[PDB]
Swiss-Prot record:
It is found in: Nucleus; Chromosome; Chromosome, Centromere. This is Chromobox protein homolog 5. There is a cross-link at K41 (Glycyl lysine isopeptide (Lys-Gly) (interchain with G-Cter in SUMO2)). Phosphorylation of HP1 and LBR may be responsible for some of the alterations in chromatin organization and nuclear structure which occur at various times during the cell cycle. Phosphorylated during interphase and possibly hyper-phosphorylated during mitosis. GO terms for molecular function: chromatin binding; DNA-binding transcription factor binding; histone deacetylase binding; histone H3K9me2/3 reader activity; identical protein binding; methylated histone binding; protein-containing complex binding; protein-macromolecule adaptor activity. It comes from Homo sapiens (Human). Its main location: nucleus. Component of heterochromatin that recognizes and binds histone H3 tails methylated at 'Lys-9' (H3K9me), leading to epigenetic repression. In contrast, it is excluded from chromatin when 'Tyr-41' of histone H3 is phosphorylated (H3Y41ph). May contribute to the association of heterochromatin with the inner nuclear membrane by interactions with the lamin-B receptor (LBR). Involved in the formation of kinetochore through interaction with the MIS12 complex subunit NSL1. Required for the formation of the inner centromere. Keywords: Acetylation, Centromere, Chromosome, Host-virus interaction, Isopeptide bond, Nucleus, Phosphoprotein, Repeat, Ubl conjugation.
Length: 57
């Protein structure tokens, strides 16, 4: 889970580009070309609309 502290970077999420197994999302950050793992449990709460756009895919 330590593998997935992307939020601590303090950037704004933009878009989930992937997932893997505790469920994790590869999160892409706004305006940069960078992505890091964050825990789905935590993304649900911090950026629910973005979590949801990932599912409608
Ligand atoms: Na959101």
């Amino acid at each position: 889970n330590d593998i997935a502290r992307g939020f601590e970077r303090g950037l704004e999420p933009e878009k989930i580009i992937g997932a893997t197994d505790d469920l994790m999302f590869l999160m892409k950050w706004k305006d940069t070309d960078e992505a890091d793992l964050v825990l789905a449990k935590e993304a649900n709460v911090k950026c629910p609309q973005i979590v949801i756009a990932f599912y409608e895919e």
